[PDB]
Amino acid sequence: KPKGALAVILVLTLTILVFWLGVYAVFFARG
Amino acid sequence: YPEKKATLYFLVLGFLALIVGSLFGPFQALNYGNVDAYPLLKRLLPFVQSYYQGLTLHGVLNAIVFTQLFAQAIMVYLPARELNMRPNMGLMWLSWWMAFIGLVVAALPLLANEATVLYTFYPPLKGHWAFYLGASVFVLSTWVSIYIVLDLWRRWKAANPGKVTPLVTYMAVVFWLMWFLASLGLVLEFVLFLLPWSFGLVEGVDPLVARTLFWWTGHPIVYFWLLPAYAIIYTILPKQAGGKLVSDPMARLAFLLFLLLSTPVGFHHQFADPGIDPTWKMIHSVLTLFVAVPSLMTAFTVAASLEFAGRLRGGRGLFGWIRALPWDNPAFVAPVLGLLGFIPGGAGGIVNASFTLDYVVHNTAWVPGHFHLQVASLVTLTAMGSLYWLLPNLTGKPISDAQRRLGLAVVWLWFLGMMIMAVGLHWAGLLNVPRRAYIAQVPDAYPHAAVPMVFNVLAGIVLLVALLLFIYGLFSVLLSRERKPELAEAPLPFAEVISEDRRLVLAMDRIGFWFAVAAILVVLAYGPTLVQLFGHLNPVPGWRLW
Amino acid sequence: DEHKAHKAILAYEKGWLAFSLAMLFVFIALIAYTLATHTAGVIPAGKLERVDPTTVRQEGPWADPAQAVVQTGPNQYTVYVLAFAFGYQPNPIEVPQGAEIVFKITSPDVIHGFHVEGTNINVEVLPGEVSTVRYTFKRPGEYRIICNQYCGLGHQNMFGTIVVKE
Ligand code: HAS
Ligand code: HEM
Ligand SMILES: CCCCCCCC/C=C/CCCCCCCC(=O)OC[C@H](O)CO
Ligand SMILES: CCCCCCCC/C=C\CCCCCCCC(=O)OC[C@H](O)CO
Ligand SMILES: CCCCCCCC/C=C\CCCCCCCC(=O)OC[C@H](O)CO
Ligand SMILES: CCCCCCCC/C=C\CCCCCCCC(=O)OC[C@H](O)CO
Ligand SMILES: CCCCCCCC/C=C\CCCCCCCC(=O)OC[C@H](O)CO
Ligand SMILES: CCCCCCCC/C=C\CCCCCCCC(=O)OC[C@H](O)CO
Ligand SMILES: CCCCCCCC/C=C\CCCCCCCC(=O)OC[C@H](O)CO
Ligand SMILES: CCCCCCCC/C=C\CCCCCCCC(=O)OC[C@H](O)CO
Ligand code: CUA
Ligand SMILES: [Cu+2]
């Protein structure tokens, strides 16, 4: 299994999600 | 090999544009850190009248001129060298000259404070006709490039009936056809509107139509910036890393998606514009999320290939492959670091695309935070790395150990400055600091931003040093006396491909068809809205407010 | 080895591509949600509403900033904002808390931003066009309007105020 490639797409997924759910929170807080 | 000389001319002119464009960035970083260094800059560069003139130059020279010259260098030369065929030289030199000429023409009013619009030059803000004219000529240079590469591909296909297009040439064909569709928005906006208006021929321009036409090009132009770096990242970097590209088909699929999805999306720059129906904003929003796919895809293909290389080179465990990679080679380091910063870059872009979430970040410092990660860091760093393999190939000039070490410093400093700046800009942007603002001249206006403002000051000083080291570096390699013809004669370090199911590759090679589809999508996504707007034009007078 | 590296990398890639798709789709669902709620009020009206930027200060609802706030429903107010080089009229804009407010903003000169600090209101303002956006202020007090679209040298100091009364 390409374990490194998986870690990279882990970090990328986490990053997307912290960014997206983060901004979604801010959206509703300002709504 | 007269294509080497023309390629060289594109790369060097690009790099000159990037250097001059970049002079203004530390000043702008300092400004987003509440520090006014403009008086110093106007001592050194007395023709500069305002922060905004600086900002136009920076935008135009870095994001338009450099990126284009790079694209034109890379996506002509590489396919030519993979096919082992000579580009039409009279055409190649023609494109360089259009590029140089349109650059000199747009430069004159820019340097003389007659076009302090931005790089978006939004009507009714009205610049000097020479700005529009020269920018036009500069960008049409690319239609010649498209021709050049279409020719090469047909000459090849003819000589090799029944074969699939080789990888790099496949990349370049789909890339240039994408860019041709994409560019029609701006050529439309320019020809029907900006030019006549700047010439005095019509009184006003409809700002909404101007913006809609603009952003037709304004999105896919950033994929036009990226894809040259991707071609490198895909077909070259796996060799430099010590491995191979893990899949030719996955690399074609990514590029094919860019062809299909790069252009029908521009309303994502217009989530805050009046007069555009929300249902269309949602359609574009979805289409924008889809265009994130070839990069999600790229993330995995490229990550697996670097891991592969690292495993070949002896690394083991979950991080050993990282450690095992050639971190002493700036040509490997520069794109890889760019890729790392592309993770938060693309996360921010996915935020910008969600229709409603854009109201949080739109026109704030968030957006420069997103894009410096994408273009000022990944594309630029990848171009910077090509110094260390592309240049020797083009010139026979050797890279000394000293120069290799300096290159490592530039590439890490440049990367680090861009990460630090990215934190300062995202965060300031979340605090509501506007982009495109001489905010240091209102020092008491953004008190809640004091913390990310420290990051911008730092970033500005780190990127000043990175840039000064780049200039000394770039000129060391260009100005050195020696020429060893074994560097000039050596092959481009094209990767080998681990192998490919042919079904998929054949389908993807029906380029005429995919091109037609891409063209239909643009009609479906832009037709209805442009027909309504063109039916209801409200042209308005122009203004100089500088 | 390459034989084994090849199909294994591709097999996991297929998984990754499916997951990432699912995540994209989830965001689409979550966006569509926002679209069904009061928070979507801030999306501009899609409809073209054309005006003449050259006479907008002389006649029509932007001509008299002190009557710009018009009650248009039992709990609704329409506000005619002018965003111009380099300010906003009226100043301040004064509105009751808890009322739905329909901002109808235009420009007599060049494009301006209309960014209401602390809210989702963030709309480009185009000369010749009226931008229409909707918001309810839940909290009383003072909200700064920011211009976030470069409009010339007066840009960095173009600010406005909205006061929301208890
Ligand atoms: C080259 C330049 C650009 C790229 C590429 C780019 C990508 C995106 N952007 Fe963007 N952005 C747009 C949203 C997106 C989306 C959804 C993507 C996507 O294509 C992103 C997909 C990318 C990913 C999902 C990342 C994949 C990660 C990879 C591939 C890294 C893997 C790492 C490895 C393999 C390392 C491993 C190695 C080890 C050693 C570990 C939107 C809105 O929807 C706006 C308007 C916002 C507003 O309100 O104005 C915005 C505005 C801009 C502007 C401002 C224009 C202006 O001046 O007004 C610029 C210049 C720009 C450029 C760039 N943009 N963008
Ligand atoms: C020394 C490196 C650099 C620094 C310190 C820097 C800094 C900055 C800052 C702080 C801004 C925001 C200014 C504002 O919004 O008012 C900005 C804007 C911008 N930068 Fe950079 N930059 C650098 C290099 C680059 C490069 C390499 C590119 C692209 C290749 C680039 C493209 C842009 C663009 C397109 C804008 C937006 C201009 C506009 O909104 O009209 N920058 N830069
Ligand atoms: C290779 C080079 C990489 C670059 C690394 C450089 C790091 C920056 C220096 C930090 C030392 C701290 C110095 C801070 C002291 C001066 C602060 C200051 O007084 O600023 C002006 C004042 O705030 C206006 O009122
Ligand atoms: C190597 C690069 C790989 C990519 C990895 C880097 C990506 C950065 C991810 C998250 C930063 C978020 C930091 C923490 C989030 C802050 C949330 C928060 O504190 O909210 C404010 C609250 O109101 C209290 O004041
Ligand atoms: C590595 C270089 C790249 C730099 C990476 C950029 C940093 C931005 C990070 C995260 C965005 C997440 C959004 C932050 C979410 C915090 C706010 C929040 O949680 O909102 C609730 C609160 O009630 C509201 O007022
Ligand atoms: C606030 C943000 C500013 C901080 C910026 C942090 C962002 C991540 C930085 C570096 C990640 C690089 C990870 C990979 C480094 C690899 C080098 C290595 O592993 O060494 C092998 C050795 O050098 C034999 O050649
Ligand atoms: C090897 C050398 C690496 C060392 C580099 C340091 C790394 C991170 C620390 C400090 C950055 C400080 C730079 C900030 C300069 C002054 C910031 C400022 O202007 O602060 C004003 C204050 O918050 C209101 O008056
Ligand atoms: C709460 C939200 C969840 C966030 C948590 C992060 C999710 C992990 C992300 C991506 C993994 C994508 C890889 C999917 C693995 C697919 C399995 C597969 O393809 O297996 C074939 C192989 O032959 C085996 O036997
Ligand atoms: C294998 C698992 C299959 C299961 C797949 C499920 C995917 C789960 C994700 C998101 C659901 C979206 C929830 C939508 C509800 C939105 C509510 C909200 O966000 O509240 C905002 C505000 O307070 C009110 O005005
Ligand atoms: C590494 C990157 C880290 C990122 C760091 C995250 C910081 C974001 C903070 C807040 C956003 C939330 C917005 C909430 C705005 C509400 C404030 C408000 O309501 O104030 C104005 C009002 O007029 C009073 O009467
Ligand atoms: Cu009005 Cu910036
Ligand atoms: Cu875009």
Q: Where are the alpha helices (DSSP H) in B396-484?
A: 401-430, 450-479
Q: Does C5 contact B206 at a Cβ distance shorter than 8 Å?
A: no
Cis peptide, bond prior to residue B539, ω within 30 of zero: no
Pick the closest to residue B477 from B372, B331, B379 (CA basis): B331
C-alpha gyration radius of chain B:
23
User: Does residue B425 contact residue B369 with C-beta atoms inside 8 Å?
Assistant: yes
Asked whether residue C3 is marked as a ligand-binding residue, the answer is no
- C6 known ligand binder: no
Instruction: Evaluate whether B346 touches A20 at the Cβ level (below 8 Å).
Output: no
Nearest to C37 by CA among B356, B23, B308: B356
What is the rounded CA–CA span in Å between residue B84 and residue B405? Answer: 33
Query: Could you give the angle at the alpha carbon of B377 between the alpha carbons of B101 and B14, nearest 5°?
Result: 15
Element (H, E) at B266: none
Any idea what DSSP says for residue C140? -
Check if the beta carbon of residue C83 is closer than 8 Å to that of residue C127.
no
Residue located via tokens 């294994």: C8
The position carrying tokens 């990460």 is B419
CB half-sphere exposure, B184, CA atoms < 13 A: 12
Chain mean position to CA B421? 18
Q: Which residues pair with C77 in a beta bridge?
A: C71, C101
Q: Which of C113, C111, C97, C118 is nearest to C166 (CA)?
A: C97
Residue C102 is classified by DSSP as E
Half-sphere exposure of A13 (CA within 13 A, CB side): 17
**Residue B371 is among the residues annotated as catalytic for this protein:** yes
The residue among B312, B350, B426 with the most chain A CBs within 10 A of its CB, best to mutate, is B350
Return the structure tokens found at B437. 């603002």
Q: Which residues form ligand 4's pocket by a CB distance below 6 Å?
A: A 11, 15, 18; B 340, 343-344
List C-alpha distances in Å: C23 to A13, A25, B133, B289, C45: 9, 17, 44, 10, 29
Nearest-angstrom CA–CA distance, A27 and B115? 36
CA max distance for chain A: 45
**Alpha helices for B204-274 (secondary structure H):** 207-218, 220-235, 237-240, 248-261
Q: Which ligand is nearest to the CA of B427?
A: 10
Active site includes B372?
yes
CB pairs under 8 A, 24+ apart, for B322-329? B322/A4, B324/B242, B325/B241, B325/B242, B326/B240, B326/B241, B326/B242, B328/B404, B328/B408, B329/B240, B329/B388, B329/B404
Describe chain B by its helix, strand, coil percentages, rounded to 5: 75, 0, 25
Report residue B511 as tokens: 């380029």
Contact between C111 and C95 under an 8 Å Cβ cutoff? The reply is: no
Closest CA to B517 of B295, B284, B264: B264
Count Cα atoms within 13 angstroms, Cβ side, for B494. Answer: 18
Euclidean distance between CA atoms B67 and B62, whole angstroms: 7
Instruction: Give dist(CA B171, CA B254) in Å, integer.
Output: 9
Q: Report residue B330 as tokens.
A: 């700036």
Q: Which residues pair with C89 in a beta bridge?
A: C82
DSSP letter at B374 equals I
Q: What is d(CA B545, CA B102) in angstroms, rounded to the nearest whole number?
A: 25
d(CA C43, CA B357): 11
Is the CB of A13 less than 8 angstroms away from the CB of C118?
A: no
- Calpha distance B487→B470 (Å, rounded): 22
8 Å CB contact between B86 and B239 = no
Pairing verdict, β C100-106 and C76-84: parallel
Q: How far apart are CA B267 and CA B400, in angstroms?
A: 48
Q: Note whether B343 contacts A26, CB cutoff 8 Å.
A: no
The DSSP secondary structure of B352-373, one letter per residue, reads HHSTTTHHHHTTBTHHHHHHII
In the DSSP assignment, the letter for residue B125 is: B
Helix, strand, coil share (%) of chain C residues, nearest 5: 25, 35, 40
Provide φ and ψ at B160, rounded to 5°: -145, 55
DSSP label at residue C142? E
C103-140 burial: b if 16+ Cβ within 10 Å, else e: bbbbbbbbbbbbbbbebbbbbbbbbbbbbbbbbbbeee
User: How far, in Å, CA of B431 to CA of B3, rounded?
Assistant: 50
Place of tokens 């150990």: B401
Say how many CB pairs under 8 Å bridge B and C: 199
The whole-angstrom separation of Cα B144 and Cα C83 is 43
Residue C46 alpha carbon to ligand 4 centre in Å: 35
Domain C1-44 fold is Rhopdopsin 7-helix transmembrane proteins (1.20.1070)
Spatial separation of the C-alpha atoms in residues B308 and B306, rounded to whole Å:
5
Strand partners, B227: none
Q: Is B200 left (phi over 0), alpha (psi -120 to 50) or beta?
A: left
Would you call B51 a catalytic residue per the annotation? no
Question: What would you report as the CA-atom Rg of chain C, rounded to the nearest whole angstrom?
Answer: 22
Query: Which tokens belong to B538?
Result: 């409200």
The single residue of B175, B180, B223, B224 carrying the catalytic annotation is B223
For the sheet containing C159-165, what is the strand order? C93-96, C159-165, C141-146, C112-116, C122-125
Any bridge partners for residue B428, and if so which?
A: none
- Bridge-based pairing of strands C93-96 and C159-165 is parallel
Token pair of B352 as six digits: 């910008």
Token pair 């997103």: residue: B370
C112-116/C87-89 β-pairing:
unpaired
Q: Which numbered ligand comes closest to the C-alpha of B377?
A: 2
Q: Is the peptide bond before C92 cis (omega within 30 degrees of 0)?
A: yes
CB C117 within 8 A of CB C156: no
Q: Rounded distance, CA B202 to CA B478, Å?
A: 47
| Interatomic CA distance for residues B140 and B518, integer angstroms | 21
Residue B355's closest CA among C113, C36, A16? C36
Q: What's the CATH class of domain C45-166?
A: mainly beta
CB C104 within 8 A of CB C77: no
Give C136's strand partners: C100
Query: Preceding residues of all breaks in chain B (C to N beyond 2.5 angstroms)?
Result: 499
Residue pair B187/B116 in contact (Cβ under 8 Å)? The answer is no
Q: State residue B2 phi and psi, 5-degree precision.
A: -80, -15
The CA-based angle B464-B470-B473, given to 5 degrees, is: 145
Domains of chain B, earliest start first: 1-546 (1.20.210.10)
Q: For residue C147, say whether it is annotated as part of any ligand binding site.
A: yes
Q: How far apart are CA B261 and CA B152, in angstroms?
A: 25
Of C156, C115, C111, give the one whose Cα is nearest residue B438. Answer: C156
CATH 1.20.1070.10, chain C: domain bounds: 1-44
Q: Which residues line ligand 7 (CB under 6 A)?
A: B 33, 35, 450, 454, 457-458
Name the β-bridge partners of B497. B245
Contact B420, B344 (CB under 8 A): no
d(C-alpha B354, C-alpha C30), whole Å: 9
CB proximity list for B376: less than 8 A, separation 6 or greater: B25, B62, B418
Distance CA B477, CA B491 (A): 20
Give the pairing of strands C112-116 and C141-146.
antiparallel
Q: Which of B372, B415, B446, B515 is catalytic?
A: B372
CA separation (Å) from C71 to B61, B165, C84? 50, 66, 24
Closest CA to B502 of B144, B139, B252, B193: B252
Note whether B168 and B152 are within 8 A (CB).
no
For residue B294, give every residue at least 6 positions away whose Cβ sits within 8 Å of its Cβ, in sequence order, or none.
Answer: B253, B254, B255, B257, B258, B261
**B427 alpha carbon to ligand 5 midpoint, in Å?**
7
Residues facing residue C69 across a β-bridge? C79
- Write out the H or E segment, with its range, that includes residue B131: helix B129-159
3-state secondary structure B313-346: CCCCCCCHHHHHCCCCCHHHHHHHHHHHHHHHHH
Q: Which residues of C are catalytic?
A: 84, 86
**Omega of the bond prior to C96 within 30 degrees of 0, cis?**
no
* B92: nearest Cα among B208, B186, B7: B7
Integer CA distances (angstroms), C91 to B170, C65, C129, in order: 59, 8, 21
CB-CB contact of B514 with B259 (8 Å): yes
Token match 């957006």: residue?
Answer: B367
**How far does B299 lie from chain A, in Å, by closest CA?**
7
B148 close to B158: Cβ distance less than 8 angstroms:
no
Q: Are C57 and C108 in contact (CB under 8 A)?
A: yes
Distance CA B488, CA B393 (A): 5
Q: Which of B73, B6, B4, B423 is nearest to B225 (CA)?
A: B73
Separation of first and last alpha carbons in chain A:
45
Tokens for B235? 């077909």
B299 touches ligand 1 (CB under 6 Å):
yes
For B249, counting Cβ atoms within 10 Å of its Cβ (0-12 exposed, 13-18 middle, 19+ buried), the class is: buried
B543 CB-near residues (< 8 Å, 6+ apart): B124, B125, B126, C85, C109, C110, C152
- CB contact at 8 A, C17 and B300: yes
Angle at which helix B3-31 crosses helix B51-58, to 10 degrees, equals 150
Pocket test for ligand 2, best of B122, B372, B419 (most atoms within 8 A of CB): B372
- Burial of B43 per CB tally in 10 Å (0-12, 13-18, 19+): exposed
Cis peptide before C86 (omega within 30 of 0): yes
Write the single-letter amino acid at B475. Answer: F
Distance (Å, whole) CA A21 – CA B1: 53
Chain C residue with minimal CA distance to A2? C9
Q: Which part of chain C is CATH 2.60.40.420?
A: 45-166
3-class DSSP state of B44:
helix
Nearest to C134 by CA among C31, C33, C34, C40: C40
Q: Where are the alpha helices (DSSP H) in chain C?
A: 2-35
CA distances to B213, B546, C30, C88, C105 from C124, in Å: 16, 20, 25, 14, 9
Distance CA B259, CA B252 (A): 11
Q: Which residue has 């990310």 as its token pair?
A: B452
**What is B49-110 written as a DSSP string?**
--HHHHHHHHIIIIIIIIHHHHHHHHHHHHHHHHHT----HHHHHHHHHHHHHHHHHHHHHH
B298, B175, B292: which is closest to B247 by C-alpha? B298
Give dist(CA B100, CA B97) in Å, integer. Answer: 5
